[PDB]
Design a protein around this nucleic acid. Structure first.
Ligand SMILES: [Zn+2]
Ligand SMILES: [Zn+2]
Lengths: 263, 267
DNA sequence: GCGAGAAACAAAGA
DNA sequence: CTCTTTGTTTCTCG
């Protein structure tokens, strides 16, 4: 999941679990709680979920007043709400039990993480990750973006995916955005023109905000209907009729139009 | 690679290339020759490799009389000897060709460097970097070492890594030394006792010489090492300390992965 | 001071 | 990027 998907998860959870008291926390894979499962159990049991925030692809549960739970799903993490008598599934790892149901975290890869952070350490935690700005016209400043790009010979796709220029792009939306901006994924950042950078800036926001609006991509989101390159190897570019190509860039599957996006 | 690995490489090359005349030097990544690839090609082509020395982690090729080739392998740099018709490999950057084969330099991450330096600028090259002493009893004076430590607030692990106190420790051997001397990586230099310092000094020499003897550490020319079997903490996270039984922990210290026994090494 | 970060880069690991 | 980490050194930041 990318930013839009995480934000969709944040909204669904906000509607459903805010106000709920945690009766118990149990784990079949405590190691995914990097800060220590027993500590987390001690501090959050009996507390009320007050809210759920997001920064980048990170979810932030406001539980009690002193601590926050920072959850990253990584590649395959998924939350579901189940009844109390719900049977286990193979890749369930963690559960928060409430008086009339439970919030289960599952992850086939076991990459996702929980981190218990004191409230005062949340801003620092994100500063320290060097996470870039939210992809909004409010936060994502084109001048700073331009300045950083002009200073780098990094290929634009991998650089965008670092999360430092702007937060929230994954493999799917980076390909979408480069297509929309007519930029080759292996173009060196400092070869981008000013106008090209402007369009890239806006396409980042426009695609990610649109995808939030459609509840993310499901491959129950609807953004998958609006994908122009991801998964369309061989099909015709809607803009020029060229066959969409798939190459590997810094180890990642990459879809692009060979006419609309040229190095 | 660290000092022991560079020494192992220096030995293997010394045995195999001294006396060879350079027929050609070619590069697919000329930018790693920081002083200018073309000048290097022009100055070394046709000359005989007379010897290879080492200072710290640096290799020093004596080729001809007027110039020295100073090579640093940084993180992953690797030399090998191949036949003349050898296929290229993905991360090969430079080759030095001889009449019966070639010496190829490869480096996945492209951190490694070559520099052409005139012979009478070699000693100043090293002085200018402030490289510390070689880790031998003869060169590594405990008295200077002590004075430098007593005067500094630096955390001991990053200070050792700087190469100025003593030359040749990298992330592996610094972790190993500190565990042997029972010193916490984050301990400030000036809080070290004279007896700690003495033990530290000796452990540096003892580990780096045992490492050279064992042909270096082969984790993932030079690649037949045995020292990796003698490691006590580096990469042993979650395993038992061999001295006290406690769980080896890993933390980050000045940006580097750091393995210690928290029982044996208290800050 | 100092330590922290970042640059240079690619691929493996969790 | 899903993100972090890696056998180094040199450099700028705060
Ligand atoms: Zn097209
Ligand atoms: Zn111990």
């Amino acid at each position: 999941p990318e930013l839009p998907e995480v934000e969709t998860v944040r909204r669904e959870l906000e509607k459903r679990i805010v106000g709920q008291k945690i009766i118990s926390i149990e784990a079949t894979y405590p190691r995914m709680v990097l800060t220590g499962f027993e500590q987390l159990k001690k501090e959050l049991t009996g507390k009320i979920i007050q809210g759920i925030i997001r920064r980048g692809k990170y979810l932030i549960f406001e539980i009690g007043d002193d601590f926050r739970l920072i959850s990253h799903l990584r590649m395959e993490g998924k939350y579901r709400l189940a009844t109390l008598d719900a049977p286990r599934e193979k890749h369930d790892h963690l559960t928060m039990k409430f008086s009339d149901g439970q919030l289960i975290y599952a992850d086939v890869r076991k990459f996702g993480t929980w981190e218990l952070i004191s409230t005062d350490q949340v801003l620092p935690y994100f500063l320290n990750k060097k996470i870039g700005p939210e992809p909004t016209y409010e936060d994502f400043d084109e001048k700073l973006f331009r300045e950083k790009l002009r200073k780098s010979t990094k290929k634009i796709k991998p650089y965008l995916l670092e999360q430092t220029l702007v937060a929230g792009l994954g493999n799917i939306y980076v390909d979408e955005v480069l297509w929309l901006a007519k930029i080759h994924p292996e173009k060196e950042a400092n070869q981008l023109i000013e106008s090209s950078i402007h369009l890239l800036h806006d396409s980042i926001i426009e695609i990610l905000q649109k995808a939030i609006k459609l509840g993310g991509s499901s491959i129950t989101g609807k953004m998958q209907n609006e994908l122009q390159v991801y998964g369309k190897t061989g099909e015709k570019c809607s803009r020029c009729g060229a066959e969409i190509q798939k190459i590997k860039v810094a180890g990642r599957g990459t879809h692009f139009c060979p006419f609309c996006q040229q190095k």
